[PDB]
From a paper:
The photosynthetic reaction center (RC) of the purple bacterium Cereibacter sphaeroides (recently renamed from Rhodobacter sphaeroides) is a photosensitive membrane pigment-protein complex that serves as a convenient and informative test model for studying the mechanisms of electron transfer, photosynthesis, and pigment-protein interactions. The RC from С. sphaeroides consists of three protein subunits and ten cofactors arranged in two membrane-spanning branches, A and B. The RC contains two bacteriochlorophylls (BChl), PA and PB, combined into a special pair P, two monomeric BChls, BA and BB, two bacteriopheophytins (BPhe), HA and HB, two quinones, a non-heme Fe atom, and a spheroidene molecule. Here we present an approach for stabilization of the photosynthetic reaction center of Cereibacter sphaeroides, which is the formation of disulfide bonds between its α-helices.
In three mutant forms V(M84)C+G(L278)C, A(L53)C+I(L64)C and G(M19)C+T(L214)C (pairs 1, 2, and 5, respectively), in which the introduced cysteines were close to the protein surface, disulfide bonds were formed regardless of whether these amino acid residues were on the cytoplasmic side or on the periplasmic surface. In the inter-subunit mutants V(M84)C+G(L278)C and G(M19)C+T(L214)C (pairs 1 and 5, respectively), the electron density for the S-S bonds was visible but of poor quality and detectable only with a low cutoff. The reasons for this could be increased mobility of the side groups of the amino acid residues at the interaction interface between the L and M subunits and/or radiation damage during the imaging process. In the G(М19)С+T(L214)C mutant RC, the formation of the LM complex is observed in the gel without beta-mercaptoethanol (line 3). Upon addition of beta-mercaptoethanol, this complex breaks down and three bands become visible, each corresponding to one of the RC subunits (line 4). However, it was observed that the mutations between the L and M subunits (G(М19)С+T(L214)C and V(M84)C+G(L278)C) significantly contributed to the stabilization of the RC. After 60 min of incubation, more than 50% of the native complexes remained in the sample in the case of G(М19)С+T(L214)C and more than 40% in the case of V(M84)C+G(L278)C, which was significantly more compared to about 20% of the undenatured wild-type RCs under the same conditions. In the case of mutant RCs with inter-subunit S-S bonds V(M84)C+G(L278)C and G(M19)C+T(L214)C (pairs 1 and 5, respectively), both complexes exhibited increased thermal stability compared with wild-type RCs. It is assumed that such strengthening of the RC structure occurs due to the strengthening of the complex at the level of the quaternary structure of the protein.
Residue numbers in the entry:
A (entry chain H): 9 to 250
B (entry chain M): 1 to 303
C (entry chain L): 1 to 281
Write the structure that this text describes.
């Protein structure tokens, strides 16, 4: 009536309830405790406790991160509460593209470049990566870059490539006024004669944030560049036709 | 329409990573082979180098002896005829000794002795390979998760041909070496034991197998959708959370009320997959050892 | 309530229908127009199941079961108790499932991410529809669909499979199982690989993607890479469910014998089918 097989399956469901509870607390190491829409801690936090802290040791002497810890956005958030009660949207109080909110948001990451295994810059533009070149598909360097209004914004002058992983992560585009911005690889459609970008119209390339160096990008600069560009999908909608 | 990040658009080559530094004993490393344009359209294009230590030579040799032992036997059933060999490749079978032979090794070659010899070669190939997965990680300073996850598969395998047959009294309970016959063995095993759908550890095994497809479809789609924020560089997103990890988590929070962290999702993933063979091996091990009829056993205890 | 980093993301916009009338949250859940459709279909469809439970006469959850109309009913509609519940619930389920996918598309848009997730979910919806709508319609009866019960729906699988001998011999079923097992192999390695880099041997710094790629090249001579593994995982799971629908949709519509007879197209080929010996000689 109470088998060993019977004992095994009751045991397993008990292990399972403990495994799920363990797994859930492990995924509460970012973002928790939950907050009310005014930034103060919410009363009802769920029935799983916060996890005891753990520590990663960054290579090449870059410090130790410990999660969970005190969370700070570390930047001004340009949005207004619109509602007496909770649960409603929050209004951009500015240029949400320039202010970095909504689908245009970025994160206050360390203002350094990602570092590969031997400690070198992880992303370098081809002009400075000792050894690299193009090997298949249409080579975009030289090609004109075109936005969602169907006007041109400049030309590809380089490719920023992943040194250890050997892939292209950015196009470097030169603007009508002669400066340059980085285009994320994922956000472009390379073709036989051009390079097309639905994210932005020609006139919003000038607002892609700019780098403090011509052969290194930083993690904080990568977040600003990419958040801006994807935010164009919503915020550059008036330009977009067809 | 929009770029989908399913196939790489432009491919770039540099010097290949020889992977200096760390503790890998480069005496057992090969050179680096060709690169593949074909492979580069979907993933990396670097082929090799491979690490071939003493433990990997052992694995690879007894691995081939397993394959060749079944091959000879397959040719012998073809009467050494090349045309028959092809006509019946999926129908041949190398089989364990008859039930009368017990747990004995006296069985003559043509009546199961060969099956014991192949299974010894298999046994060595899989285990020395498991030592490889622990040592290659050890060399690079990594964690042992790959070895431990491998241990879940070896469990089910070990139960099928070795632990359950021993506890049963005869090698004839073990699995044959053939394409269609191992399928036939599987269908009969469920019949002999009164419908494996009613083995609750088989039902768990299926929930985790379906869930592994659910989980991997969510996680792949989710990382491809935040790749535009460099979301596939997950270790840095663990070191320094970016907008990629935050957009990903908020999609799931907004959709089903909870969500993961860039690290934590890989814990879910390793456990989902591992529990397929953990619960599977248990289900098989109790079949016929402790329960002969699962459907009947089901009625007496719950459903 | 909110994740600590969440607020800057809750901006207006992205809806496909309704404008800002459903553009708000309830707890963690985004609502949107299709989060209201999702609620109607799913609630009603639940009310039909509870009602089906008093008819059958039990509030035991394990035991409740809802069957399609009998084969004799064909494709026409059935009395509510003689099959119509299943028939409506099916509409309710299809409604909720598709509404959920379009809710995911709104969410992708307000967050400005790709539309990968609800696209992958649509394969799940189409395997479902293959079983309850496509295959039953192509054969002529709702009765070829499966019953909605924890334990009954398992017996339908067994009855259906054994109608064609050992269903293992369905070649599409072979390819799909091959994708299903390979998916779980890849899901296990990818979890163990990334967790071995972020959680390395004691007394060591965090590993880098350099080491992920070194580990697999040591191990098997090739590494698909951090973007390949995620592409690969999606492709594995989605092709497994594709050949699932493929293996079920040809069974009993264009193929009717024991599935093992399919393999004679190779064994009975005339220029080796008469040879002495082997298995088939
Ligand atoms: C795929 C081909 C077959 C099939 C073959 C099998 C086999 C074989 C088995 C199951 C088993 C299960 N199947 Mg079934 N099953 C199919 C169709 C379905 C559908 C559906 C709407 O199409 C659903 C919801 C289910 C659901 C389930 C669960 C009862 C159980 C665990 C699966 C799991 O973890 O999945 C992965 C999903 C997750 C991990 C996420 C959580 C899923 C939750 C648990 C599903 C909730 C079901 C709920 C009780 C029913 C809907 C109720 C409404 C809420 C009102 N099956 C079709 C008919 N299914 C197993 C079992 O133990 O059965 C008794 C089993 O052995
Ligand atoms: C008619 C047939 C019976 C049946 C009989 C069985 C039997 C018998 C078994 C299963 C088992 C399984 N069943 Mg059942 N099953 C049926 C119907 C189903 C249905 C369905 C929709 O109807 C489903 C979804 C399943 C699902 C499953 C899986 C969850 C499970 C196997 C997991 C796995 O990853 O194995 C694949 C993985 C392995 C075998 C491990 C491999 C590890 C080793 C080390 C690999 C070595 C490789 C070697 C070296 C090869 C060389 C390769 C080269 C070197 C490259 N069954 C019916 C009821 N089922 C298993 C189980 O555990 O049940 C409890 C099992 O043994
Ligand atoms: C004894 C029976 C026969 C046999 C007969 C059958 C039959 C008959 C069928 C299969 C099918 C399948 N079999 Mg077979 N099969 C056998 C042996 C096996 C073995 C084995 C090791 O022996 C394996 C691995 C498999 C494997 C499989 C897969 C290829 C496939 C099941 C997955 C699928 O289609 O998912 C598809 C996924 C879904 C349908 C999920 C849909 C989910 C939807 C969109 C949402 C639900 C959400 C839910 C309601 C939400 C609830 C609330 C939440 C909890 C909040 N079979 C034996 C020989 N097999 C099935 C198939 O191919 O179907 C197409 C099928 O019908
Ligand atoms: C957690 C459960 C899942 C799982 C996990 C898993 N498997 C694993 C691992 C993990 C975590 C490993 O670390 C390990 C590995 O190294 O993966 C890359 C492994 C592994 N899983 C394997 C297979 C496998 N896993 C399976 C299943 C599963 N693995 C589960 C779904 C299955 C099935 C039936 O579903 C199989 C077949 C291996 C690829 C590998 C272990 C390798 C090994 O032990 O090799 C020893 C044998 C040899 C080195 C060589 C033998 C000779 C060969 C027969 C080839 C001969 C070829 C001949 C010369 C030419 C012709 C061939 C023809 C086809 C043309
Ligand atoms: C295609 C690859 C895999 C996949 C993909 C996939 N599924 C997904 C997603 C993706 C990418 C989602 O985005 C979505 C999600 O939100 O996940 C958290 C979903 C999801 N996959 C789910 C389940 C599920 N997926 C499964 C399968 C898989 N889904 C595939 C293997 C299975 C099975 C049996 O293998 C199950 C059980 C949910 C967790 C979720 C879908 C949630 C949803 O659509 O919710 C809205 C609807 C409701 C809350 C209820 C509607 C209820 C009906 C009106 C009444 C009940 C009817 C039903 C027919 C009864 C079933 C009886 C059973 C006893 C058989
Ligand atoms: C890197 O990135 C990633 C993350 O982020 C960092 C992630 O989180 C995730 C997500 C992964 C996880 C959280 C791991 C756990 C996931 C599973 C185990 C898969 C199974 C999931 C479930 C069983 C949860 C099911 C819950 C569902 C389907 C929704 C629950 C439904 C309700 C309670 C009500 C439905 C809500 C409605 C109708 C909204 C409308 C509201 C009105 C009031 C109207 C992934 C994939 C990811 O890769
Ligand atoms: C060209 O032809 C030549 C001859 C060159 C070839 O090489 C052709 C080769 C082939 C045609 C190969 C064909 C191979 C197959 C069809 C193999 C298919 C295999 C399977 C379906 C495997 C199914 C599962 C088998 C299992 C579960 C085996 C279990 C192994 C045991 C756990 C090991 C136990 C050890 C024992 C009993 C020995 C005891 C000794 C100890 C030291 C413990
Ligand atoms: C409602 C809850 C009910 C609970 C009922 C009792 C449960 C009993 C326990 C179940 C076991 C669950 C935990 C299993 C996971 C163990 C975590 C683990 O593995 O810890 C060591 C880990 O660091 C090593 O890996 P890394 O962190 O990567 O080094
Ligand atoms: C009654 C029979 C039950 C089953 C018998 C045993 C079967 C084989 C067991 C396999 C378990 C799977 C591997 C463990 C889970 C995955 C590992 C994990 O999540 O963390 C591993 C962790 O520690 C890291 O170790 P270190 O690198 O040494 O710190
Ligand atoms: C000279 C050497 C000859 C080599 C011959 C080539 C063999 C191909 C085998 C497997 C490739 C598929 C690998 C898929 C499983 C990998 C799972 C994984 O962890 O991927 C992450 C990635 O490896 C890092 O980011
Ligand atoms: C069965 C697989 C899914 C298990 C669900 C685990 C619990 C999810 C709820 C966690 C709590 C969410 N919350 C409120 C803290 O945000
Ligand atoms: C699992 C291995 C799959 C590798 C096959 C890759 C197919 C080649 C795709 C070429 C892509 C061409 N294009 C225009 C998208 O760049
Ligand atoms: C030192 C090894 C030399 C590298 C050899 C390069 C191979 C040619 C690359 C083209 C790829 C061909 N293909 C179709 C397999 O992709
Ligand atoms: C080094 C090979 C390991 C041998 C393990 C398998 C034993 C095989 C038994 C075959 C029977 C031989 N004999 C003499 C009884 O006919
Ligand atoms: C790590 C993921 C945890 C998800 C939990 C999945 C629970 C599914 C239960 C299916 C029940 C099978 N059975 C035969 C015991 O009834
Ligand atoms: C075991 C299968 C059932 C899985 C149910 C999914 C868990 C419910 C998730 C909702 C959690 C959100 N909530 C209510 C905590 O805020
Ligand atoms: Fe990942």
């Amino acid at each position: 009536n109470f088998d060993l097989a019977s004992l095994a399956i009751y045991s397993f469901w008990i292990f399972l309830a403990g495994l799920i509870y363990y797994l859930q607390t492990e995924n509460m190491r970012e973002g928790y405790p939950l907050e009310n829409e005014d930034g103060t801690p919410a009363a009802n936090q769920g029935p799983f406790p916060l996890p005891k802290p753990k520590t990663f040791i960054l290579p090449h002497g870059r410090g130790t991160l410990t999660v969970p810890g005190p969370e700070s956005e570390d930047r001004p958030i340009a949005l207004a509460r619109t509602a007496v009660s909770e649960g409603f949207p929050h209004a951009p109080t500015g240029d949400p593209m320039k202010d970095g909110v909504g689908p245009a948001s970025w994160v206050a990451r360390r203002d350094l470049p990602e570092l590969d295994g031997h400690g070198h810059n992880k992303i370098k533009p081809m002009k400075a990566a000792a050894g690299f070149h193009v090997s298949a598909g249409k080579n975009p360097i030289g090609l004109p870059v075109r936005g969602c209004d169907l006007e041109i914004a400049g030309k590809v002058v380089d490719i920023w490539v992943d040194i250890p992983e050997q892939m292209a992560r950015f196009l470097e585009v030169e603007l009508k006024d002669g400066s340059t911005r980085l285009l994320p690889m994922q956000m472009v459609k390379v073709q036989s004669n051009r390079v097309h970008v639905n994210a932005l119209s020609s006139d919003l390339f000038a607002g892609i944030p700019t780098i403090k160096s011509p052969t290194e990008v930083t993690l904080l600069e990568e977040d600003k560049i990419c958040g801006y560009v994807a935010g164009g999908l919503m915020y550059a909608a008036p330009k977009r036709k067809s | 329409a929009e770029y989908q990040n399913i196939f790489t658009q432009v491919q770039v080559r540099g010097p290949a990573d020889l992977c200096m530094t760390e503790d890998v004993n480069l005496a057992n490393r090969s050179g680096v082979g060709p690169f593949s344009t074909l492979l580069g359209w979907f993933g990396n294009a670097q082929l090799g180098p491979i690490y071939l230590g003493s433990l990997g030579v052992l694995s690879l040799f007894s691995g081939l002896m397993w394959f060749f032992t079944i091959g000879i036997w397959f040719w012998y059933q073809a009467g050494w005829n090349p045309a028959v060999f092809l006509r019946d490749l999926f129908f041949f079978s190398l089989e364990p000794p008859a039930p009368e032979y017990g747990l004995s090794f006296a069985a003559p070659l043509k009546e199961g002795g060969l099956w014991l010899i192949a299974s010894f070669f298999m046994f060595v190939a899989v285990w020395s390979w498991w030592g490889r997965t622990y040592l290659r990680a050890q060399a690079l300073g990594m964690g042992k998760h790959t070895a431990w996850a491998f241990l879940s598969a070896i469990w089910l395998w070990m139960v099928l041909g070795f632990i359950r047959p021993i506890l049963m009294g005869s090698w004839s309970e073990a699995v044959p070496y053939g394409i269609f016959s191992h399928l036939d063995w599987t269908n009969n095993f469920s019949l002999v034991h009164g419908n494996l759908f009613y083995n609750p550890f088989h039902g768990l095994s299926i929930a985790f197998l379906y869930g592994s497809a659910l989980l991997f479809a969510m996680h792949g789609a989710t990382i491809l959708a935040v790749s535009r924020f460099g979301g596939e560089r997950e270790l840095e997103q663990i070191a320094d959370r970016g907008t990629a990890a935050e957009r990903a988590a908020l999609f799931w929070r907004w959709t089903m009320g909870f969500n993961a962290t860039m690290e934590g999702i890989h814990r879910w993933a390793i456990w989902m997959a591992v529990l397929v063979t953990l619960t599977g091996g248990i289900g098989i091990l109790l079949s016929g050892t402790v329960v002969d009829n699962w459907y009947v056993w089901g009625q007496n205890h719950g459903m | 309530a909110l994740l600590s980093f969440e607020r800057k993301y809750r901006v207006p916009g992205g809806t496909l229908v309704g404008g800002n009338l459903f553009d708000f949250w309830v707890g963690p859940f985004y609502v949107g127009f299709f989060g209201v459709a999702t609620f109607f279909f799913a609630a009603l469809g639940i009310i039909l199941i509870a009602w089906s439970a008093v008819l059958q006469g039990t509030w035991n959850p394990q035991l409740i079961s809802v069957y399609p109309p009998a084969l004799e009913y064909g494709l026409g509609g059935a009395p509510l108790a003689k099959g119509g519940l299943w028939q409506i619930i099916t509409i309710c389920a299809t409604g909720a499932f598709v509404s959920w996918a379009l809710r995911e598309v709104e969410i992708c848009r307000k967050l400005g991410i790709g539309y990968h997730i609800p696209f992958a979910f649509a394969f799940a919806i189409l395997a479902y529809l293959t079983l309850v709508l496509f295959r039953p319609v192509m054969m002529g009866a709702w009765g070829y669909a499966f019953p909605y019960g924890i334990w009954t729906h398992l017996d339908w699988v067994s009855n259906t499979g054994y109608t064609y001998g050992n269903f293992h011999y369905n070649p599409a079923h072979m390819i799909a199982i091959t994708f299903f097992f390979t998916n779980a192999l890849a899901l296990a390695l990818h979890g163990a690989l990334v967790l071995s880099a972020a959680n390395p041997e004691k007394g060591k710094e965090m590993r880098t993607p350099d080491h992920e790629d070194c580990f697999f090249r040591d191990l098997v001579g090739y590494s698909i890479g951090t973007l390949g593994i995620h592409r690969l995982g999606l492709l594995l799971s989605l092709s497994a469910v594709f050949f699932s629908a493929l293996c079920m949709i040809i069974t009993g519509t264009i193929w009717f014998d024991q599935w093992v007879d399919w393999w004679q197209w190779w064994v009975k080929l005339p220029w080796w089918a008469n040879i002495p010996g082997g298995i088939n000689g």
